[PDB]
Amino acid sequence: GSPDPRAELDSTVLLTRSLLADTRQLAAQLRDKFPADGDHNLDSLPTLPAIDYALGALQLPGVLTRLRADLLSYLRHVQWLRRAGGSSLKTLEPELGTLQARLDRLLRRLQLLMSRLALPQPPPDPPAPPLAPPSSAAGGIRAAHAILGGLHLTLDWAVRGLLLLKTRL
């Protein structure tokens, strides 16, 4: 019947938290295997979404639309990573592929949430060209740290924004 937005948000936030946990674990696996010099630029990829720290600005339709766009970008980068990452990354390949599948599940839940709540369809941003292969095996590892680190932050700030937004419904 008629949807309860608080329940729809709850189930969407819960699923987001699970993906956040998966991402946090995989980033830790990678860091444990490549401690290197500590940390590298999360800006090591200019093609990834920027992190939106501005809470209280956007409303629910806008927050959801931008999250959908961000997640689709992360899915593109994860798919790219699994293909051209190199031998160094294939020890993470099962977890990466499961992360990609759960990323798709969250995208579908967001699409369902927007349909159930009658929120106008997000305008499709034109398609970015294919991601070029990393210039080196090290470059692929740096890309993996940036992709997983950025996804974690995106999901963390989405949970925060959706919970503070639900507080007012």
Numbering used by the authors: 10 to 178
Provide the publication's sentences verbatim.
Phage display was subsequently used to identify variants with higher inhibitory potency resulting in IL-11 Mutein, which contains W147A combined with mutations of AB loop residues 58–62, 58AMSAG62 to 58PAIDY62, that were reported to increase affinity to IL-11Rα43. We solved crystal structures of IL-11Δ10/Mutein and IL-11Δ10/W147A at resolutions of 1.8 Å and 1.5 Å, respectively, to understand the structural consequences of the mutations. The structure of IL-11Δ10/W147A is similar to the structure of IL-11Δ10 (RMSD 0.3 Å relative to IL-11Δ1049), indicating that the W147A mutation does not alter the structure. In contrast, the AB loop of IL-11Δ10/Mutein shows significant conformational shifts relative to the WT structure caused by alterations in key contacts between the loop and the four-α-helical bundle. Thus, the 58PAIDY62 mutations alter the position of the AB-loop, shifting the register of key loop-core interactions by three residues, while maintaining the composition of the interacting residues. This register change is due to a shift of the LX(S/T)LP motif that mediates loop-core contacts: In IL-11Δ10 and IL-11Δ10/W147A the motif is 51LDSLP55, while in IL-11Δ10/Mutein the interacting motif is 54LPTLP58. The result is that the bulk of the loop is shifted toward site-III and the N-terminal turn of helix-B is unfolded. We note that this configuration of the C-terminal segment of the AB-loop and N-terminal turn of helix-B resembles the structure of wild-type IL-11Δ10 bound within the hexameric complex. In combination, these results indicate that that both IL-11Δ10/W147A and IL-11Δ10/PAIDY can mediate assembly of the hexameric signalling complex, albeit to differing extents, while formation of site III interactions by IL-11Δ10/Mutein is abrogated, and assembly is stalled at the trimer stage.
Interleukin (IL-), an IL-6 family cytokine, has pivotal roles in autoimmune diseases, fibrotic complications, and solid cancers. IL-11 activates downstream signalling pathways by binding its two cell surface receptors: the IL-11 specific receptor, IL-11Rα, and the signal-transducing receptor, glycoprotein (gp)13013,26. Following the formation of the receptor complex, the Janus kinase (JAK)/signal transducer and activator of stat (STAT) and extracellular signal regulated kinase (ERK)/mitogen-activated protein kinase (MAPK) pathways are primarily activated. IL-11 and IL-6 utilise a homodimer of gp13026,34,35 while other IL-6 family members exploit a heterodimer of gp130 with a second signal-transducing receptor, such as LIF receptor (LIFR), OSM receptor (OSMR), IL-27R/WSX-1 or IL-12 receptor β−2 subunit (IL-12Rβ2).
